[PDB]
Amino acid sequence: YCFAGKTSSISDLKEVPRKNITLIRGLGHGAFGEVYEGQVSPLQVAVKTLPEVCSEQDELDFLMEALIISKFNHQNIVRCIGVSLQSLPRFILLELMAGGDLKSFLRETRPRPSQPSSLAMLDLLHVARDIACGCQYLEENHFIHRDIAARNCLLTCPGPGRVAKIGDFGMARDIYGGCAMLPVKWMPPEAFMEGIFTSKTDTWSFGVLLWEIFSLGYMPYPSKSNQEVLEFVTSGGRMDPPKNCPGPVYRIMTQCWQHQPEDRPNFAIILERIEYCTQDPDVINTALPI
Numbered sequence: 549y550c551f552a553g554k555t556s557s558i559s560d561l562k563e564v565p566r567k568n569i570t571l572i573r574g575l576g577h578g579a580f581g582e583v584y585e586g587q588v589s590p591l592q593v594a595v596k597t598l599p600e601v602c603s604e605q606d607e608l609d610f611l612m613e614a615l616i617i618s619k620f621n622h623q624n625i626v627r628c629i630g631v632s633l634q635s636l637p638r639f640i641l642l643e644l645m646a647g648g649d650l651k652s653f654l655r656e657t658r659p660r661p662s663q664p665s666s667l668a669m670l671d672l673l674h675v676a677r678d679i680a681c682g683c684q685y686l687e688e689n690h691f692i693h694r695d696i697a698a699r700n701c702l703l704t705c706p707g708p709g710r711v712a713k714i715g716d717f718g719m720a721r722d723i724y725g726g727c728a729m730l731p732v733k734w735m736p737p738e739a740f741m742e743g744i745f746t747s748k749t750d751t752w753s754f755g756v757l758l759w760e761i762f763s764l765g766y767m768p769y770p771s772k773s774n775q776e777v778l779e780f781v782t783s784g785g786r787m788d789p790p791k792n793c794p795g796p797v798y799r800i801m802t803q804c805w806q807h808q809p810e811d812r813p814n815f816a817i818i819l820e821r822i823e824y825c826t827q828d829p830d831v832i833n834t835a836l837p838i
């Protein structure tokens with residue numbers, strides 16, 4: 549694997565003795581295996597596991613994740629603490645995000661008649677700004693994530709002062725299973741039509757993510773199916789604003805969704821435009837829907 553002008557190696561990872569690792573509680577499922585809260589000797593960690601019953605192709609997939617995530621050095625990308633590959637099942641140790649994934653956080657935190665005043669519009673911009681920062685770092689380093697979505701984002705803590713980061717790279721690794729598994733609802737025309745991926749691919753996906761954030765955890769093209777989206781988008785159809793979404797934010801989503809890739813902004817521009825949205829009172833004083 550190459551990144552930042554260097555070729556990484558399996559030895560360059562930090563092997564953590566298995567005896568030092570201790571699993572605390574299950575946290576969900578990954579693309580393939582499972583995930584746990586853990587402790588290393590007292591360091592709080594997250595542990596991605598590789599099933600023992602796995603293919604020899606899956607083993608190599610697992611290693612690649614570790615190598616990929618290890619060469620990143622950015623505050624908006626989950627840190628890789630190390631690996632425990634010499635023992636079975638093979639572990640990958642990663643930064644722990646107490647806020648959990650973003651999609652769930654948005655759904656769990658939707659303002660409701662019981663407790664409406666939970667989140668504000670300014671909080672959503674910071675999350676979007678956080679992810680835009682990471683994507684720019686990837687673009688600057690010529691890495692194409694190719695699966696920018698709320699489900700692959702994590703939060704350090706649920707309360708104020710949370711930071712959002714990109715937490716999963718299973719897609720970039722797989723391309724470096726099938727059609728019904730393709731994230732069609734997050735991809736531009738040239739991706740699901742031709743299989744072309746660039747930094748302007750991630751620009752389109754970030755627009756969908758933006759829509760996810762200001763719909764507060766909704767599913768893109770809610771009532772539509774994958775193929776209905778596939779025909780909707782190629783025809784020039786685009787999603788409507790999320791409920792109460794301020795104009796200048798939606799205007800970012802619509803530029804991210806330009807049909808031709810060269811008509812979409814890069815992440816330097818998106819960031820700048822997003823920061824500008826944090827500077828408009830009429831934007832950050834808009835109330836969220838219940």
Ligand SMILES: Cc1cc(-c2cc(C(F)(F)F)ccc2O[C@H]2C[C@@]2(CN)c2ccc(F)cc2F)[nH]n1
Pocket residue numbers: 575576577578583594626642643644645646647648649650699700701702714715716
């Ligand atoms: C690498 C890492 C995972 C967690 C994590 C932490 C917590 C808690 F709040 F309890 F600490 C809860 C869930 C967490 O991820 C779980 C949800 C999963 C599994 N689909 C996930 C989501 C997005 C993603 F990008 C990677 C994931 F693995 N932290 N770090």
Ligand SMILES: Cc1cc(-c2cc(C(F)(F)F)ccc2O[C@H]2C[C@@]2(CN)c2ccc(F)cc2F)[nH]n1
Pocket residue numbers: 799800801803804806810811812813814817818821822
């Ligand atoms: C290609 C593209 C750029 C944008 C864009 C998006 C946003 C938003 F806030 F919405 F993110 C804001 C500004 C945008 O371009 C503006 C910066 C300009 C004008 N100097 C620009 C720069 C380079 C270029 F090649 C075309 C340009 F028009 N969209 N598409």
